Amino acid sequence: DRRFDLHQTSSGRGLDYRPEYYFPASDFKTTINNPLPPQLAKQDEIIKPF
Amino acid sequence: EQRENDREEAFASDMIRNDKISELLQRRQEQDIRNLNSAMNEFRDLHQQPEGRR
Amino acid sequence: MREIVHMQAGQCGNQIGAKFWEVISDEHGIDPTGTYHGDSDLQLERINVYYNEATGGKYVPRAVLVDLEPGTMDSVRSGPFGQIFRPDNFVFGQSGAGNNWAKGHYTEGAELVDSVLDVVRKEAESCDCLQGFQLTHSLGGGTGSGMGTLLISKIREEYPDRIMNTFSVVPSPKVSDTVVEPYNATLSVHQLVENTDETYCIDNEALYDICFRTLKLTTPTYGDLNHLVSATMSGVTTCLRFPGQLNADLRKLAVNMVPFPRLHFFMPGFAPLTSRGSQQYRALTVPELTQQMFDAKNMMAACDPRHGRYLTVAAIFRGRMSMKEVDEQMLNVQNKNSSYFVEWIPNNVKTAVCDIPPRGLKMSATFIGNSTAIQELFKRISEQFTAMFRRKAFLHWYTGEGMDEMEFTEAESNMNDLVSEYQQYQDATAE
Amino acid sequence: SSHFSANQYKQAFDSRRLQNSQIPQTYKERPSSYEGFTQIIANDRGHLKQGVPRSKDSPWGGFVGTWEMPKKIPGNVTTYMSRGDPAIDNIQKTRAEHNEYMRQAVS
Amino acid sequence: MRECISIHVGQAGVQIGNACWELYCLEHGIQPDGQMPSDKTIGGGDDSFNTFFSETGAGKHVPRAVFVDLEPTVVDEVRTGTYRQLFHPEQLITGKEDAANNYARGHYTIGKEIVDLVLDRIRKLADQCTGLQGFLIFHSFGGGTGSGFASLLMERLSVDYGKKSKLEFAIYPAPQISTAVVEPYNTILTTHTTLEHSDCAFMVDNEAIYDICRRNLDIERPTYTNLNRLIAQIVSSITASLRFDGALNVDLTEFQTNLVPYPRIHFPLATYAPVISAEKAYHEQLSVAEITNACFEPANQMVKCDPRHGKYMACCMLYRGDVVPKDVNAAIATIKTKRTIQFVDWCPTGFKVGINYQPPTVVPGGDLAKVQRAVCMLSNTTAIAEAWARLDHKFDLMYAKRAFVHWYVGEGMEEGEFSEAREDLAALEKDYEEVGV
Amino acid sequence: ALPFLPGNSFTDPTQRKFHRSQSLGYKNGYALPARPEVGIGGEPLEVNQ
Amino acid sequence: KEAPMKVAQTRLDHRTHRPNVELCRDPAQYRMVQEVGEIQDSIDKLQQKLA
Amino acid sequence: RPLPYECTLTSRETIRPRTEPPEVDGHISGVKHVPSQWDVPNLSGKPGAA
Amino acid sequence: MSRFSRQLPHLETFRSPNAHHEAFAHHATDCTARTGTFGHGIYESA
Amino acid sequence: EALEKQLEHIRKDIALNKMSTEIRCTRPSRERGRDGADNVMEKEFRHLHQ
Ligand SMILES: Nc1nc2c(ncn2[C@@H]2O[C@H](COP(=O)(O)OP(=O)(O)OP(=O)(O)O)[C@@H](O)[C@H]2O)c(=O)[nH]1
Ligand SMILES: Nc1nc2c(ncn2[C@@H]2O[C@H](COP(=O)(O)OP(=O)(O)O)[C@@H](O)[C@H]2O)c(=O)[nH]1
């Protein structure tokens, strides 16, 4: 059973557990993976370079 | 000789497309770092206030 | 059908060689599973020089991964292209090296050397005509230096007719990355002088300058550095794997570059390297490719060729190009830079042409330079050696696990002799 | 009392490989050969006979408890480098005192 | 595979161990029960925790720590509260009588009572270990268990374990602030016996971190929890490369080789950067050169020995986060060109870099702001000779009249040990003088 | 999309774990390679499942 | 391409069985719907190439 | 050859059949279905844009 | 105390004693215009 | 303080003399030799040390 007087002690107050942090929130998106503009989204002009 | 000129032109245009794509991805990564730093400042403002310290 | 057995030791070796295997894997068309997925039959014809037929269309590398401690080898396994390797080629202890040459070589490297010789013996006897060995490591640590030198010595003892290539990234002029690297580099090169057929000294400062000036690259990381080293490895072994107008293998390069058995330390370099936003301003010609080859900022060695003389040069071009253009460009650069070449050897250039450039490129080029400017690197290591050897700093360790001071004295004397020979064949005249 | 090698498997069965970070004990590897008809050199009691070269070590083995260790321990330098001559001398002195006190406590 | 055993001896060691294992659990996603929050597959499934936590057959993470004290108050406070099910109860050794700020009590009396049990627990943990890297021993150079039992335990560890790494994390008595009175006596007597049975001892006081928390963190009245949190960040940055993949990995066997130039010179300092709060980190652009300059600044040092007064011997820079080796190289080059930082003449290669990709974690409700990059700065300098001289002066002042000697002698230590210990640190003091030229 | 050249490599900056699962380790006296079921961060691999 | 469509659909209609207040429009359901759409678009492109 | 050996006369948007195209799941070789002009990315910079 | 000020150093890090003597000579000169004890510091400032 | 400023100036002149020796050694190998200017530089080195 746990101990309900840890607030008096210094190590209880400074060592009470809280869960971790994940740094990017679940709305952050990377723009590097967006499709290219059509001037740069051309075709490969070299097909058989061997 | 027309075939050789067209081959050189094709390789050249492929490389122009390649490095323009790479430069665009470089600017996209720079904007990604900018947005990550903004999100980090927002996270510090949100969670790490001195009133929330133990 | 010749074969190359590739060995990678240390954390630096296990990173750079893994990048090298990944580069030649997606150059030959091998997928992360291990199966062939290319388009041409040229990628499939000469594949046994690095791979072994495992399962039908599956090809496994002939790599031998060596470390005193399972460090970066675990990350190599868990990264991309990490399950192509045979699972029992990973030879590993559990103690550390501690960036200690004697830990890598004498005490803790003694328990793993028998296992590594067993693995590399099983790999080497399977080849019908073995050509040589290719070791990747660092001359600054314990595993890359100590176990690497021990492995070179034992492989030379068992096979004293094969070509030994070592890449062995060397200590930097500025910034150390290890405080005992003068001792490590001196004790390692003391055996790299008398054992290896050829060594391609690479400096991380030169790599950083290449990334900053010729590639912009505000965030380089070690991936691009290992990619450049991998490109140089592929350039120096491409004549085995693809047909060309003028072939030159490892033994041919070793014959055509080293004049004397002591001088086999080279300056690798790769061309073309373009800053992001300059491909439209540059035009691809053989003259600009050769001038980028012979530019002093392009080599991965921090020593400056202007402070020295080119004993020999190897130029391995890759791409559809004219032999007249190649020979005329070599003649032109040799005639214009007539003071940077030794006068008592005419045509200090061995050319090679491969017909298959790397993907996404029309022409590529690999420059190997045996020059007398390597004496700057060896004099820097000798100076930083004798700075602390006179005060016996960081040497109670090496004495503790048990070598004598006569080994350090012999190593520094060997380095000074190599400096003397490189200085002799820079001011020696013909007549 | 017989850790008599494993030939190919001497690479294994090492104290470092079997999670024994302590220093190991050296048995006699590589067994020797004999001729035959070894002398009985004993009786049906556990005795050692008369004239047998009996050892001079303790019959209960050599082990020291905590309350009979030396008060000072040298530290296993094994290097003798970059130290002064009196440092070498008194390191030998403490090593000799250590060996003498363990020998006296065992005997 | 890269197992480490953490022996926390004394009240300072146990409290630092609390603040350390809290951060280790937050890093490896371990609840204060020993279990993963999710199942065996998701939210985990890795084996990166085996450097610190062993795994039972069911999936319960138990630490590789041995908590030792002679008083029962702090150890029972650990046993009853928050991490009451995480720590192993047999690895929570405590006694009846404390050593009461007495080296000889911790060395011959009650400290020698428990060393058999402590070594039994240590050898059980080492038999669990399958590739042990070393012992991280957390103690103080204050009084009692942190000096006497720590020195005795390290003597026994050197006796039985051979030349395994024995890295100390030692709380050095500050030049002005000090709690005990017999603290110079205990410190002299414990450095005399831990000169030989040691590989390296990272030296972290309290007053310098107090000044750091006042100046850089704006706490203006911090406490032992904050101090031990910063020490936990230091030890996490040291041990990070054994758990997280990086460009340059540094193991525990390397710190001795790259920070001990001569025997008995094995006392490097410690520094963490950027130690700073959120309202100040909002205005900063924290980069590699900036945090390297902060590390080499003679105000972020976590021991009150300014490097202007001495010469550097060795310099371990542990970069941790989204740090790039190009800017690492540029920052170290500009530090080498900087003149206020002075390196000794026989060491041209004075730097050792270890780069890890893991960003610095933050304790919830903690003091430090979250940053993308940090440095553990670990220097072996001759500026600690000033601290050794000051502590020897304090010992000589206390020993001229020979106050507080009757306690030590009347409960069991010979008085010649005081004289030979003062001779040993006089020899050390001259050693630092001879190294500095 | 980019061809595999030394100047055309990019990395994900939003990766936040960077762990290292000890697939390569020992047993009671032997070298055990062990197949990797997890890579770096904690995500399962995508090559041999 | 077929299997990730199965993954996204099964995830959607497993998460639809949540309790009263836990039935939340979290910013993972939106991304999963966009994944369904992108999978269908890629399947359409591949079937065009097949034709 | 009126073109280099590494290039092809047809382009990415030029691939057409010569004989009668088969019926494969609604898609026909040669047709371009809806042009779908609405796939223009939102480059305004608002939250949720590309 | 004077009983603890005549002790020779434990480490010998100068090979021959001639180099030790020729370094500590002119090191005793160099201790002036230093910072801190033993003259191992920077040369202050101006 | 004034004498320490003069000592700092003397050490800066020492650094200048070392730099001057290095730039003089930078010279082509044909001239080199032993010069009266070189002897004056060594005399200045000795005078600054004294
Ligand atoms: N940084 C830090 N130092 C501490 C902490 N607790 C105690 N100390 C140091 O420890 C010194 C006091 O001696 P202790 O180490 O606690 O003594 P002990 O090891 O418990 O042994 P005894 O003397 O028998 O109690 C003080 O000078 C403090 O500097 C802590 O939580 N954090
Ligand atoms: N180019 C390159 N150099 C590296 C890499 N990793 C380490 N190094 C170099 O290797 C040196 C350290 O040697 P190390 O490999 O750690 O020796 P080991 O500990 O015995 O394996 C440093 O000077 C680094 O510059 C890498 O990925 N790429």
Ligand SMILES: [Mg+2]
């Ligand atoms: Mg206590």
